[PDB]
Design a protein around this ligand. Structure first.
Ligand SMILES: CCS(=O)(=O)N1CCC[C@@H](C[C@@H](CO)Nc2nccn3c(-c4ccc(C)cc4)cnc23)C1
Ligand SMILES: [Zn+2]
Ligand SMILES: [Zn+2]
Length: 550
């Protein structure tokens, strides 16, 4: 007998889609909060996965589509497509992507979730459908833009979950006391998981790599396996040197093994950057060749008795390097001697930085996936989008010239170095104007609260050409103007031109270190800045601390 959207919320909490502590759950919550929570299609996609195992492959979901209408619509459509394919819903029971994204018909989205709650697939899973037996969605268009909600995704599967299962299934150690005894439990775990790790590396080389060489070209082996044989080397040595440190009573040398191997573990950059490319190539040679497909089964049978496939095993190196800081965090907790706790604290710092190095590669690999998708959907685009930096924001806007008065309804893609003025042809987008942001600057003019009256300007440094940018709400103007400020700030960062330097956004392809903080320029895409004059490379926040140019 409660309003239908409140029933939907309760069904969503039951499907483990919404955190029970979420504001949407609370008394007094407005229907707009449910629309904001479902808008980007992430929870909706998770909802189908919670009802049906592998209804949606995580690689098909954009897990954080913050400022991208493009990524949001892809998610909503995936959710919608899976609904008729795997849940057997009719097109009449389904809503159109904009009924949710631009809250054109929110009731329809609720009806669809009700149809979904009433499907057997869900009914059987123990979950109570809804309803058991007015007009509040009309003002939704006006309220849809409101606050980044980090906590909204608490019930969403991480990208690294699949890999963490395979890792823990393998590293599974056999199963109160004092701090020293607990400290010894940590040391034992560090060695036991490392031994299994080095053997797992060995298993990949011996039962997969070497036997597959008879089936695959050296080219295919390089793509699929990368530097697994080099990782085996580093670890075979790391294992020997770590055991020596654990061999001497007291293990007050252990931390130095970690430090020495921090630079040696840089070989992971190569592994992390090519791992997904490897997986897709492995998946294709396997799908095309029945002989390779059968050999992989035999390799899996002879190595672990069908427990792990090669595809699962190749996810293990990224997981191991993420665990080092966790195994050291627990050890340092149970280390109650001032110098030894501080020595291991330095090793922990070195392993946390390696965990950040991992995550930077992952982020940049996700950014490239986004860029290549933008590229395919954008027509009349001659330029390669990867030369223009990171995507900042994308969606509909209204535009005119500085002198002109009549506004044109356009679609825009903002990246660090460029603004792409488009007009969509259904799903594809026509590039009408490619604005290079190098010569432009943002100017806001206060002169309100009328749809599309919220405007700022894009003015050229030569005063040559201009643009008046109009947005539906004051919230959308705020969102867009902040991203333009962020973009322009990345083009001309603080201290870019200091001490004779000409620091510009640069995408390093070779392993470079910051000339100021000595730390790695982490990642594979626009990692930082370069001065063409003295060839100095730095982090955005480090430009001040760089010695002068010549
Ligand atoms: C030279 C060959 S390459 O393969 O290394 N090569 C590829 C193309 C991209 C290159 C860009 C450089 C820029 O500085 N980044 C890294 N190099 C080494 C390592 N890395 C990490 C890293 C380090 C440790 C761990 C555990 C995980 C990740 C992150 N980021 C880089 C690098
Ligand atoms: Zn310089
Ligand atoms: Zn730096």
């Amino acid at each position: 007998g409660s309003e239908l959207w409140r029933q939907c919320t309760h069904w969503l909490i039951q499907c483990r889609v919404l955190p029970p502590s979420h504001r949407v759950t609370w008394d007094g919550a407005q229907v707009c909060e449910l629309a904001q929570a479902l808008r980007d299609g992430v929870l909706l996609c998770q909802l189908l996965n919670n009802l049906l195992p592998h209804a949606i492959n995580l690689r098909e979901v954009n897990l954080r589509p913050q400022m991208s209408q493009f990524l949001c619509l892809k998610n909503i459509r995936t959710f919608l497509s899976t609904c008729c394919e795997k849940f057997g819903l009719k097109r009449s029971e389904l809503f159109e992507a904009f009924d949710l994204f631009d809250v054109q018909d929110f009731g329809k989205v609720i009806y669809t979730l009700s149809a979904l709650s009433w499907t057997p697939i869900a009914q059987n899973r123990g979950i109570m459908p809804f309803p058991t037996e007015e007009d509040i969605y009309s003002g939704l268009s006006d309220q849809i833009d409101d606050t980044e909600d980090e906590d909204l995704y608490d019930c969403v599967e991480n990208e690294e979950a699949e890999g963490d299962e395979i890792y823990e299934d393998l590293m599974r150690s056999e199963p109160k006391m004092t701090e020293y005894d607990k400290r010894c439990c940590c040391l034992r775990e560090i060695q036991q998981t490392e031994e299994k790790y080095t053997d797992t590396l060995g298993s990949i080389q011996q039962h997969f790599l070497k036997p597959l060489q008879r089936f695959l070209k050296p080219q295919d082996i390089e793509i699929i396996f990368i530097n697994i044989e080099d990782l085996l080397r580093v670890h075979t040595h790391f294992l020997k040197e770590m055991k020596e440190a654990l061999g001497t009573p007291g293990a007050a040398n252990l931390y130095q093994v970690f430090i020495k191997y921090k630079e040696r573990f840089l070989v992971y950059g190569r592994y992390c950057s090519q791992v997904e490319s490897a997986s897709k190539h492995l998946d294709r040679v396997a799908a095309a060749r029945e002989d390779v497909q059968m050999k992989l089964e035999e390799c899996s049978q002879r190595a672990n008795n069908g427990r792990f496939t090669l595809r699962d095993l190749l996810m293990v190196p990224m997981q191991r390097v993420l665990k080092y800081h966790l195994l050291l965090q627990e050890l340092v907790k149970h280390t109650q001697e001032a110098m030894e706790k501080e020595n291991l604290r330095l090793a922990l710092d070195a392993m946390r930085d390696l965990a950040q190095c991992v995550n930077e590669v992952k982020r940049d690999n996700e950014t490239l996936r986004q860029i290549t998708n933008f590229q395919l959907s954008i027509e009349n685009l001659d330029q390669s989008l990867a030369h223009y930096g990171r995507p900042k924001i994308d969606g509909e806007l209204k535009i005119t010239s500085v002198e002109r008065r009549s506004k044109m309804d356009r679609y825009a893609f903002l990246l660090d170095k460029a603004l792409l003025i488009c007009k969509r042809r259904g799903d594809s987008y026509d590039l009408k104007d490619f604005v290079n942001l190098h010569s432009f600057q943002v100017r806001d003019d206060s002169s309100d609260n009328k749809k599309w009256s919220h405007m700022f300007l894009l003015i050229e440094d030569q005063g040559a050409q201009g643009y008046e940018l109009f947005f539906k709400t004051r919230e959308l103007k705020k969102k867009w103007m902040e991203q333009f400020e962020m973009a322009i700030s990345n083009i001309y960062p603080e201290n870019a031109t200091a001490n004779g330097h000409d620091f510009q956004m640069f995408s390093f392809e070779e392993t470079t270190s910051c000339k100021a903080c000595q730390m790695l320029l982490r990642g594979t895409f626009y990692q930082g800045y370069r001065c063409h004059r003295c060839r100095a490379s730095a982090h955005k926040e480090c430009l001040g601390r760089v010695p002068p140019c010549g």
